[PDB]
Write an enzyme that holds these catalytic residues in place. Structure first.
Site, PDB file in Angstrom:
ATOM      1  N   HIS A 157       0.134  -5.587  -1.456  1.00  0.00           N
ATOM      2  CA  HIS A 157       1.461  -5.562  -1.102  1.00  0.00           C
ATOM      3  C   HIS A 157       1.810  -7.086  -1.039  1.00  0.00           C
ATOM      4  O   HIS A 157       2.968  -7.302  -0.846  1.00  0.00           O
ATOM      5  CB  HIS A 157       1.997  -4.979   0.299  1.00  0.00           C
ATOM      6  CG  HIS A 157       1.494  -5.312   1.553  1.00  0.00           C
ATOM      7  ND1 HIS A 157       0.648  -4.730   2.039  1.00  0.00           N
ATOM      8  CD2 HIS A 157       1.999  -6.410   2.330  1.00  0.00           C
ATOM      9  CE1 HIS A 157       0.366  -5.572   3.395  1.00  0.00           C
ATOM     10  NE2 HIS A 157       1.238  -6.434   3.315  1.00  0.00           N
ATOM     11  N   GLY A 182       2.286 -11.367   8.754  1.00  0.00           N
ATOM     12  CA  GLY A 182       1.297 -12.564   8.261  1.00  0.00           C
ATOM     13  C   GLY A 182      -0.056 -12.559   8.283  1.00  0.00           C
ATOM     14  O   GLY A 182      -0.862 -13.050   8.018  1.00  0.00           O
ATOM     15  N   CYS A 214      -1.643  -9.567   7.704  1.00  0.00           N
ATOM     16  CA  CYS A 214      -2.152  -8.630   6.694  1.00  0.00           C
ATOM     17  C   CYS A 214      -3.269  -9.255   5.901  1.00  0.00           C
ATOM     18  O   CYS A 214      -3.340 -10.616   5.652  1.00  0.00           O
ATOM     19  CB  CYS A 214      -1.286  -7.944   5.830  1.00  0.00           C
ATOM     20  SG  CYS A 214      -0.031  -6.959   6.786  1.00  0.00           S
TER      21      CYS A 214
HETATM   22  C1  NJE Z   1       5.127  -6.697  10.521  1.00  0.00           C
HETATM   23  C2  NJE Z   1       3.562  -6.662  10.555  1.00  0.00           C
HETATM   24  C3  NJE Z   1       3.095  -6.534  11.773  1.00  0.00           C
HETATM   25  C4  NJE Z   1       1.680  -6.150  11.948  1.00  0.00           C
HETATM   26  N1  NJE Z   1       1.162  -5.805  11.004  1.00  0.00           N
HETATM   27  C5  NJE Z   1       1.528  -5.786   9.670  1.00  0.00           C
HETATM   28  C6  NJE Z   1       2.833  -5.907   9.585  1.00  0.00           C
HETATM   29  N2  NJE Z   1       3.682  -5.971   8.337  1.00  0.00           N
HETATM   30  C7  NJE Z   1       3.446  -4.873   7.517  1.00  0.00           C
HETATM   31  O1  NJE Z   1       3.040  -3.725   8.172  1.00  0.00           O
HETATM   32  C8  NJE Z   1       4.211  -4.647   6.182  1.00  0.00           C
HETATM   33  N3  NJE Z   1       4.373  -3.419   5.354  1.00  0.00           N
HETATM   34  C9  NJE Z   1       3.238  -3.487   4.643  1.00  0.00           C
HETATM   35  C10 NJE Z   1       2.635  -2.291   3.978  1.00  0.00           C
HETATM   36  C11 NJE Z   1       3.966  -1.956   2.893  1.00  0.00           C
HETATM   37  C12 NJE Z   1       5.417  -2.060   3.856  1.00  0.00           C
HETATM   38  C13 NJE Z   1       5.301  -3.324   4.567  1.00  0.00           C
END
Ligand code: NJE
Ligand code: NJE
Lengths: 304, 304
Positions: free
Chosen positions: A41, A143, A145
């Protein structure tokens, strides 16, 4: 003396972290040999997130669009490929800090350490369990990921998790290092049902053995139980049913303490039915399930 | 999303760990520049332990008696000196992996990461607090002496603790990196009174702010309190009295959440007087005091 929620030393993993930027988005990548692994992503923009067409988005990208930076130095990308939900960016330089490593798919109920990173820089390390429903209850912000989970056996790092998503409930989901999600999850911005979760019974028993080893013994009682009887209580309290394979992995702890596994099950049964009565076990006021039997043996024997 | 008991990444410290052997005993040493620091009791034998005459024991030792090994390679010892309860072994080679570092004496109530080691090899990393009575509740076995505690600020490691002793109660004691014990302790095999301990109030408040930030809000109420009233409750429940300096350090969290510090004190007062009623806050069934306000801000903002 003492028992802590201990993570593996993170240095071998810190030497593998890089920052990956594609277009607007920056996340973490894992540089092992001449390949950088990261969540796919990184190629999305906001309009894509509800259901990205990853194959089409990646067709718009070239090697030179993936900006990979190892601290100060820039890596030259000479190939890219998408495998499940991960991207593999071939670079022209092998990571000099690549440790001995393996990619493993862990089982639910197993534990691992997470090196939380932002912009390719490590922030902190913590230990956690993969829930029976394949989610993880981590500490991750935007950030993070691409941060990874791992275990270490002597000088070998077994990478088991890459962080991809925060579900709308605040729980976390990710993949193995081949990009296959743990659980039913997909990398898109949608509400997604996580299965019914359970408490990891064998880990709670392992932790009760760690408690007795360290002198917290108040919960020991004059009772015993059977697998059948204990499993009726496990059913009521949403604990995983205990099997002989679980009893077998607890053998070393039963041998060290002299407390038969079914006798420890009788202590756990009483704790489930009566609670802790305002007391603690190893500094916890709840029944802890993030230590496997292997973790307890390792921590109680000082394995390096 | 999520809040974990996170330790600092340990890699910078892992590169400093060595094994020190004097006579029979092997423990850990910290190699920074051309000096190895370790607990002075490496020079004792069993008959010495009740009350070692450290000056006389060290007079029997020469540079060549201190065997220092950095993994595979042997270090050549060219000087030795005892400073308080630590030995400083001058070596002929500066550690190439020496990070930017400082030696600091932490205050009770502050937190730090411990890299538990055996035979100069890292075993695991965990975060803990220095108790108000100067003890630490760690996870240490025989051979862990010389393991260190530290904090990191950008690329600077502030070493604050070296492990020296397990008290007969199973609680841990150690020194700063100049060898001065935290607390009233002495490095001998005797029962030693640790002061009356208290719960670190400002840290519990910081953790309640971390809980609200992450969505655990059930404990918020319609009440407020004063410092005087709250301190009557803190006295009853053996919590540190709260001061304006503590209220001031909680400012960033009060500003982020919009919850005035004294309003959070009123939530804490109710939790102390009524308990958790079988509920949890950030996965804990007790009031957690091992996160400082700085730790909460760092974890909630993703500092690297
Ligand atoms: C904001 C945050 C906090 C902690 N861990 C991850 C995130 N971000 C996401 O999950 C974004 N997401 C990825 C998969 C496709 C859709 C968008
Ligand atoms: C056995 C153990 C476990 C955890 N931490 C430390 C130890 N060992 C000691 O405390 C030995 N002690 C040192 C100070 C002078 C007397 C002997």
């Amino acid at each position: 003396s003492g028992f802590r929620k201990m993570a593996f030393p993170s240095g071998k993993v810190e030497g593998c972290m890089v920052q990956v930027t594609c277009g607007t988005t920056t996340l973490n990548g894992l540089w092992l040999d001449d390949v950088v692994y990261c969540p796919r992503h990184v190629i999305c923009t906001s309009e894509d997130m509800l259901n990205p067409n990853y194959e089409d988005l990646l067709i718009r990208k070239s090697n030179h669009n993936f900006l990979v930076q190892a601290g100060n130095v820039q890596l030259r990308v000479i190939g890219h490929s998408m495998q499940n939900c991960v991207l593999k960016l071939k670079v022209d330089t092998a990571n000099p800090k690549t440790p001995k490593y393996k990619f493993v798919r862990i089982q639910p109920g197993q534990t691992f350490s997470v090196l939380a990173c932002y912009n390719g820089s490590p922030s902190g390390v913590y230990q956690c369990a993969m829930r029976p429903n394949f989610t993880i209850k981590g500490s991750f912000l935007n950030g993070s990921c691409g941060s990874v989970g791992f275990n270490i056996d002597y000088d070998c790092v077994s990478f088991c998790y890459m962080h991809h998503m925060e579900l709308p409930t605040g729980v976390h989901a990710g993949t193995d290092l081949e990009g296959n999600f743990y659980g039913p999850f997909v990398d898109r911005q949608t509400a997604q049902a996580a299965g019914t979760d359970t408490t990891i019974t064998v880990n709670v028993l392992a932790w009760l053995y760690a408690a007795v080893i360290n002198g917290d013994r108040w919960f020991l009682n004059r009772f015993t139980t059977t697998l059948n009887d204990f499993n009726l209580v496990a059913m009521k309290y949403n604990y995983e049913p205990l099997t002989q394979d679980h009893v077998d992995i607890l053998g070393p702890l039963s041998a060290q303490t002299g407390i038969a596994v079914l006798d420890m099950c009788a202590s756990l049964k009483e704790l489930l039915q009566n609670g802790m009565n305002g007391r603690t076990i190893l500094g916890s006021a709840l029944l802890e399930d993030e230590f496997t039997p292997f973790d307890v043996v390792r921590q109680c024997s000082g394995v390096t």
